[PDB]
């Protein structure tokens, strides 16, 4: 066997793997937002301490 079509049957599967999705799909409002929230929370923590 040389390949398995792991793409979404949900219906018209572009991308086999969630890693292949990240390659084609560029900086979506998404994961980056979560990181941005975390940094904000740290700045808040730092202000309270000072």
């Amino acid at each position: 066997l040389k390949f398995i079509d792991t793409s979404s049957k949900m219906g018209h599967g572009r991308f086999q793997t969630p890693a292949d999705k990240l390659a084609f799909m560029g900086p979506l409002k998404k994961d980056r937002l979560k990181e941005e929230a975390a940094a904000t929370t740290a700045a808040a923590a730092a202000a309270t301490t000072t």
């Binding site: 040389k2 390949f3 079509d5 572009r14 991308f15 292949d20 084609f24 560029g26």
Partner: protein
């Protein structure tokens, strides 16, 4: 089975996955999937279709990896002696610094004066004889 690229939406075409149309001429167009097929059959400009990687490049969305590659090459690989005087001898002539070079110059010019004056004088001597 080779992962090709969708010639309108830039999306990778994993084994079988859709359809490839070959024109009469024959210009092969590769489609991931029906949505692409139908949009371009309907004659949409991919450049106004915000679903293509093609427009996204033009429209400056995302890129990063491709833009990092481009800049800086000078390149100077070697001196070129061998045959003329077997390497050491060219290396010897090459090295001998300006002060010694000016000596070689000037000595040769001094030797040359005598031959020029001699021939001018000799022709001046020769001319009376007829």
């Amino acid at each position: 089975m080779k992962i090709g690229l969708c010639a309108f939406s830039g999306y990778k075409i994993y084994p079988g996955h859709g359809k490839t149309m070959v024109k009469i001429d024959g210009k092969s167009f590769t489609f991931l999937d029906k949505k692409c097929e139908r949009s371009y059959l309907m004659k949409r400009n991919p450049r106004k279709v915000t679903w293509t990687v093609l427009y996204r490049r033009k429209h400056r969305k995302g890129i990063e990896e491709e833009a990092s590659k481009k800049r800086t090459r000078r390149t100077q690989k070697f001196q070129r002696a061998i045959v003329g005087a077997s390497l050491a001898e060219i290396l010897a002539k090459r090295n001998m610094k300006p002060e010694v070079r000016k000596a070689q110059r000037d000595q040769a010019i001094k030797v040359a004066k005598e031959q020029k004056r001699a021939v001018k004088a000799a022709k001046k001597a020769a001319a009376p004889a007829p």
